[PDB]
Amino acid sequence: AAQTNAPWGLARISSTSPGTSTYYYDESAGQGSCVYVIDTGIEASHPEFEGRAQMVKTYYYSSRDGNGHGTHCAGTVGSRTYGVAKKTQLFGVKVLDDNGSGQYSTIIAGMDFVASDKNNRNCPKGVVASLSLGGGYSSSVNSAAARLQSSGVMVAVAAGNNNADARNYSPASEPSVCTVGASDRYDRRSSFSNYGSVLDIFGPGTSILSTWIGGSTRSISGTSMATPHVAGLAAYLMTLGKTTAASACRYIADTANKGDLSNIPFGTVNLLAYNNYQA
Ligand SMILES: [Ca+2]
Ligand SMILES: [Hg+2]
Ligand SMILES: [Hg+2]
């Protein structure tokens, strides 16, 4: 299939070269897989989700996304127009408050929750978890991510927006998970993107158009925007049977666009998510 005039990030992900505008992809579009979006929540009622989204857990008074970025993230994962895996199932887990904040304790609980909950869902093709959040190093937060990963869920997490080494950030510093850095339209590392040996891959994260609360759309930037591209790509490949939850991150890196990025400091991988689609 082909999506003309797609958002830059989607096109990038299906091209060996920057500057294209069509998103090529397999019609299967991730049907059969499930992506948990651990964020501020999801405006499930957004027409872009086509009823493929559901809230399954909140740690606050309401299950609603009063922030928007959670909706944005989910959109990049599997919205009709803005998503990578256009036919995936989305489950929102509200660990962050309407201000976009959350306590380590809550975030951990949210991870333990997905590990369990997945057992009651029908996701024949696999389970993914997308975590566009983080903070200062914590061994417990890291540990929670590792458990989730070991439970059979493909865990994708943002590298952080400090323009620093991701080693001092959690759950970014957890080696067993998939740490995602940001890239811009010109194949440059995103100015704010964290880097370091702990990163596994880069995805598009500068000026990302996607869904927003109130049934609208919005373009924002961050390693937070890149993460969902990877989570989406993972769901997509899983339904294709190319890879499993345990080896997805490595499969993505193996098959990535190599050496295309600029502004990549020595010691950081130079790999860009790539779907390798061939009509
Ligand atoms: Ca890793
Ligand atoms: Hg987000
Ligand atoms: Hg987002």
From Swiss-Prot:
<keyword id="KW-0378">Hydrolase</keyword>
<feature type="binding site">
    <location>
        <position position="16"/>
    </location>
    <ligand>
        <name>Ca(2+) 2</name>
    </ligand>
</feature>
<feature type="domain" description="Peptidase S8">
    <location>
        <begin position="7"/>
        <end position="279"/>
    </location>
</feature>
<feature type="disulfide bond">
    <location>
        <begin position="178"/>
        <end position="249"/>
    </location>
</feature>
<dbReference type="GO" id="GO:0005576">
    <property type="term" value="C:extracellular region"/>
</dbReference>
<dbReference type="GO" id="GO:0006508">
    <property type="term" value="P:proteolysis"/>
</dbReference>
<dbReference type="GO" id="GO:0004252">
    <property type="term" value="F:serine-type endopeptidase activity"/>
</dbReference>
<keyword id="KW-0479">Metal-binding</keyword>
<feature type="binding site">
    <location>
        <position position="177"/>
    </location>
    <ligand>
        <name>Ca(2+) 1</name>
    </ligand>
</feature>
<keyword id="KW-1015">Disulfide bond</keyword>
<dbReference type="GO" id="GO:0046872">
    <property type="term" value="F:metal ion binding"/>
</dbReference>
<keyword id="KW-0645">Protease</keyword>
<comment type="similarity">
    <text>Belongs to the peptidase S8 family.</text>
</comment>
<comment type="function">
    <text>Hydrolyzes keratin at aromatic and hydrophobic residues.</text>
</comment>
<keyword id="KW-0720">Serine protease</keyword>
<feature type="active site" description="Charge relay system">
    <location>
        <position position="69"/>
    </location>
</feature>
<feature type="binding site">
    <location>
        <position position="200"/>
    </location>
    <ligand>
        <name>Ca(2+) 1</name>
    </ligand>
</feature>
<keyword id="KW-0732">Signal</keyword>
<feature type="active site" description="Charge relay system">
    <location>
        <position position="39"/>
    </location>
</feature>
<feature type="binding site">
    <location>
        <position position="260"/>
    </location>
    <ligand>
        <name>Ca(2+) 2</name>
    </ligand>
</feature>
<protein>
    <recommendedName>
        <fullName>Proteinase K</fullName>
        <ecNumber>3.4.21.64</ecNumber>
    </recommendedName>
</protein>
<feature type="active site" description="Charge relay system">
    <location>
        <position position="224"/>
    </location>
</feature>
<keyword id="KW-0106">Calcium</keyword>
<feature type="binding site">
    <location>
        <position position="175"/>
    </location>
    <ligand>
        <name>Ca(2+) 1</name>
    </ligand>
</feature>
<feature type="disulfide bond">
    <location>
        <begin position="34"/>
        <end position="123"/>
    </location>
</feature>
<keyword id="KW-0865">Zymogen</keyword>
